[PDB]
Design a protein around this ligand. Structure first.
Ligand code: MG
Ligand code: MG
Ligand code: MG
Ligand code: MG
Ligand code: MG
Ligand code: MG
Ligand code: MG
Ligand code: MG
Ligand code: MG
Ligand code: MG
Ligand code: MG
Ligand code: MG
Ligand code: MG
Ligand code: MG
Ligand code: MG
Ligand code: MG
Ligand code: MG
Ligand code: MG
Ligand code: MG
Lengths: 117, 67, 152, 70
RNA sequence: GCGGCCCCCUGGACGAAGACUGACGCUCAGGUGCGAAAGCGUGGGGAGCAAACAGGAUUAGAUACCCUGGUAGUCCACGCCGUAAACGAUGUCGACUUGGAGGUUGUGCCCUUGAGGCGUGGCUUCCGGAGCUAACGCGUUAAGUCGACCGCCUGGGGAGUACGGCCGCAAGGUUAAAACUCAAAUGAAUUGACGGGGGCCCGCACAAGCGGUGGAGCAUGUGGUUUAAUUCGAUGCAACGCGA
RNA sequence: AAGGAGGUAUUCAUGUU
């Protein structure tokens, strides 16, 4: 409906899943897509190919805002983190900024205990 | 590598000199290791103190992303 | 093999047409060392196929091979978790071998009376993308695409 | 690692710069280290072991130049 | 044991040159104090994490490992507790005895010619010589060579347990046996064989193919059952169309 | 993830970037 032409794409790339959300410059979400919601479960949900498909579906979903210039904020140690960026560039957006926004504590809260597997 | 404080006779590094300190932080804003820069250990400690004092007074950023 | 270094056996071309592909096709179709029986089947099947299509025997045969040749298959990988189907591109030599094998298998599991007639009908179905041979080509392709996530 | 797209720079070239910038800031190594808590004793043990083996390999190498293998 | 930055109060160590006291020293049972974490008492505070616990899976079972939660606890103040693989598994003090490469912190000199050169102190890591070490090792920071003083050891199990005393709110701590039982327990190193340790390599071992076996009928061997007898042997691979 | 090269690794004007 409304026209923006400059958005921000946030890539939340976890070890298990990848969520791509395209927002306006002010933080208002226009649309979103997830690897786990694009038809992938478990061992396929945590793959770089699934992240590429999620970005494709989100771009197709945000089509009615006439976005032309996308900034990219990547967060997390995901198996994606790039497939998403290459797929946005392929889909047709003009990538103007690529920043990593991974939260690093300055020795804050204690992390969970190590898994004994 | 050669320390640039021993060769200049510098006694205290000083946190108010935001030209030398900018050479000794990275782009993200963290302090560069002495193993990379070739600074001596005595001046490394002084330099780390000066960078932390400058951060408190917001002469240097703590990180690249809070701004 | 392990100390690999195995070398390729050269195969003579067929007498009637001088094509290594046709010679290998006769070999794949041959059973129990009865090459004369197999050679008669291939020549009869090619003759009737060329009467139908109306092109050169070798050409019409090549136009069936083109529609059966696979472009990607799936091997299996025991490294990651031993459950991995990795799509891999097939080299051209193996493409011809797989196309011929599928054509012969489809022609055998048919309903016509004579093997020559079964083979001709399979080659026609391959040349118009409608037979069980071209069906297996498509089936392998879709399996590889479903495992494309594991291509890496 | 905040990479700005430069003029005429294709996407592959910019993406290589961004990937190297992150690998230079060591983000992924930091995250992997903070996934789970490790006791201070475990941390000290691991640090000391790496130093011992690193020193031993340097000394082993610096003596390997002494002799000929054939 | 101590890790952001700043301030306030405060302890020790080291170096330079000089002055001063004039053996004022070392060790130390008893005693006194400090002493991780868990725990205890009283009151706070509680984001994260997390015994117990609850649920979900895994499994023959799973009171576990894995997952989702989650209380005491972890934090503070004031008291207990007094213990750890509290380890360098190495008591403190002093003297003497070949070397090398470093780290860290002072200081002296020479041309600082420009991060240089040359010395002399403290602490510290790694190699190592003689000698010591059952051996591993150790080596001027000894586990060489000596001296002072204190702590401990006397086969393994029973047992750091019982009883008694002392200490503690408790948990317990500390001091500490015997009967009985065994002929060994043990430390280091050697040769193997192992490892759900590591590397390198090979074989129709796998993979790539072709044809089978397992289904049917029959031939044949074995097991079992049956019989008066169904003669005897081979019976994991490496017995079973085997002696035959 | 796989391979190659250099080292125990940098001095390598700044600037530009
Ligand atoms: Mg977890
Ligand atoms: Mg005493
Ligand atoms: Mg406590
Ligand atoms: Mg309490
Ligand atoms: Mg309370
Ligand atoms: Mg849990
Ligand atoms: Mg004790
Ligand atoms: Mg300790
Ligand atoms: Mg220790
Ligand atoms: Mg002891
Ligand atoms: Mg030694
Ligand atoms: Mg007791
Ligand atoms: Mg008692
Ligand atoms: Mg096989
Ligand atoms: Mg049978
Ligand atoms: Mg018998
Ligand atoms: Mg027998
Ligand atoms: Mg006998
Ligand atoms: Mg016998």
């Amino acid at each position: 409906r409304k026209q923006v032409s400059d958005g921000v794409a946030h890539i939340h790339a976890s070890f298990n899943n990848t969520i791509v959300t395209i927002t306006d410059r002010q933080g208002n979400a226009l649309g979103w897509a997830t690897a786990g919601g694009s038809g992938f479960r478990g061992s396929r949900k945590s793959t770089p190919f699934a992240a590429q498909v999620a970005a494709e579906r989100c771009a197709d979903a945000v089509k009615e805002y006439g976005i032309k210039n996308l900034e990219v904020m990547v967060k997390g140690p995901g198996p994606g983190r790039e497939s998403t960026i290459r797929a946005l560039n392929a889909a047709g957006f003009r990538i103007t900024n690529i920043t990593d926004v991974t939260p690093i504590p300055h020795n804050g809260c204690r992390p969970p205990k190590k898994r004994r597997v | 590598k050669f320390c640039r404080f021993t060769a200049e006779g510098v006694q205290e590094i000083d946190y108010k000199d935001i030209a030398t300190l900018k050479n000794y932080i990275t782009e993200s804003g963290k302090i560069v290791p002495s193993r990379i820069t070739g600074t001596r250990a005595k001046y490394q400690r002084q330099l780390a103190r000066a960078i932390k004092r400058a951060r408190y007074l917001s002469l240097l950023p703590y990180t690249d992303r809070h701004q | 093999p392990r100390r690999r270094v195995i070398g390729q056996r050269k195969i003579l071309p067929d007498p009637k047409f001088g094509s290594e592909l046709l010679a290998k096709f006769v070999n794949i179709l041959m059973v129990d060392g009865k090459k004369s029986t197999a050679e008669s089947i291939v020549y009869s099947a090619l003759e009737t196929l060329a009467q139908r299509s109306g092109k050169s025997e070798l050409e019409a045969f090549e136009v069936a091979l083109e529609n059966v040749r696979p472009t990607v298959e799936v091997k299996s990988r025991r490294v990651g978790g031993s459950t991995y189907q990795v799509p891999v591109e097939v080299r051209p030599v193996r493409r011809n071998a797989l196309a011929m094998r599928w054509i012969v298998e489809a022609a055998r599991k048919r309903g016509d009376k004579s093997m020559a007639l079964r083979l001709a009908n399979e080659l026609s179905d391959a040349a118009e993308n409608k037979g069980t041979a071209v069906k297996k080509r498509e089936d392998v392709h879709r399996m590889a695409e479903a495992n494309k996530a594991f291509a890496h | 690692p905040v990479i700005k797209v430069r003029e005429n720079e294709p996407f592959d070239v910019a993406l290589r710069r961004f990937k190297r910038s992150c690998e230079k800031a060591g983000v992924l190594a930091e995250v992997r280290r903070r996934e789970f808590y490790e006791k201070p004793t475990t941390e000290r043990k691991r640090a000391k072991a790496s130093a011992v083996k690193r020193h031993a390999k340097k000394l082993a190498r610096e003596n390997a130049r002494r002799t000929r293998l054939y």
